[PDB]
Amino acid sequence: VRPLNCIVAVSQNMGIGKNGDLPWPPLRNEFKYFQRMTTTSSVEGKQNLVIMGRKTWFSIPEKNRPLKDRINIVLSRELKEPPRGAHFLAKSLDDALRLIEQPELASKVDMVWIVGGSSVYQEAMNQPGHLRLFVTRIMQEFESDTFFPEIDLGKYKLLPEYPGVLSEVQEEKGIKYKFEVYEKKD
Numbered sequence: 001v002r003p004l005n006c007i008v009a010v011s012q013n014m015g016i017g018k019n020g021d022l023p024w025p026p027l028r029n030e031f032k033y034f035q036r037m038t039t040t041s042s043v044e045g046k047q048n049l050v051i052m053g054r055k056t057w058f059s060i061p062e063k064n065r066p067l068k069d070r071i072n073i074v075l076s077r078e079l080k081e082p083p084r085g086a087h088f089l090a091k092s093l094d095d096a097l098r099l100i101e102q103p104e105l106a107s108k109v110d111m112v113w114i115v116g117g118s119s120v121y122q123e124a125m126n127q128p129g130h131l132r133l134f135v136t137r138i139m140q141e142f143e144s145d146t147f148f149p150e151i152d153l154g155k156y157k158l159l160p161e162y163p164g165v166l167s168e169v170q171e172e173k174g175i176k177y178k179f180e181v182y183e184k185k186d
């Protein structure tokens, strides 16, 4: 509940999102991994929590909203009420982070996942604490309108291995990709 786990999928050119959706065609096997990692809590009775920007939320198909079996928090400085389906609405990441650490929530929340928005990824990476970056390396370039922040190898260490994560290269619809995990302890 204290460590922040960012999860993303980026192309070679750090591509992320395009015109409101993903820059590449639907990679259903990649969604499976995103789903398993953000959804699997390490304790029964507790649900993992996902935090995302207002655009990421509405970019997700309505039929897949909210992200089931996960507590959904949306960040927005303009909405006044949580969008239909969302569990909580926060006006800043700080407010979200403080909320999650409340006793009333620490009882039913396990892992915390950051799943959407370039700015959200940025601010999450720009703060003290224990940080982990779960990055899916899409080994191919795609025209993008949004990107992922650079990863400082002097600050983040590439973990040689992580429990539950396979390191072999994968492929779907002719597109190869692999899962990586970086860590910043502070």
Ligand SMILES: NC(=O)C1=CN([C@@H]2O[C@H](COP(=O)(O)OP(=O)(O)OC[C@H]3O[C@@H](n4cnc5c(N)ncnc54)[C@H](OP(=O)(O)O)[C@@H]3O)[C@@H](O)[C@H]2O)C=CC1
Pocket: 007, 008, 009, 010, 015, 016, 017, 018, 019, 020, 021, 022, 052, 053, 054, 055, 056, 057, 059, 075, 076, 077, 078, 079, 090, 091, 092, 093, 115, 116, 117, 118, 119, 120, 123, 146
């Ligand atoms: N390749 C991948 O893994 C992923 C790609 N994407 C994609 O990224 C693109 C969208 O990118 P991006 O524009 O960055 O999306 P975001 O979802 O981060 O949209 C930003 C909006 O969200 C809110 N927000 C973000 N940070 C904060 C904060 N600190 N406090 C308050 N509100 C905040 C604001 O809401 P408002 O304007 O309402 O105030 C702001 O305009 C799309 O194509 C999308 O699909 C998304 C997730 C994963």
Ligand SMILES: COc1cc(Cc2cnc(N)nc2N)cc(C#CCCCC(=O)O)c1OC
Pocket: 007, 008, 009, 020, 021, 022, 030, 031, 034, 035, 036, 056, 059, 060, 061, 064, 067, 068, 114, 115, 116, 136
């Ligand atoms: C709007 O673009 C998207 C971004 C995301 C976020 C996303 C994808 N991949 C990684 N590695 N990280 C993310 N945060 C997810 C989806 C979707 C879906 C389906 C199944 C979900 C479940 O968990 O139940 C998505 O839609 C396409």
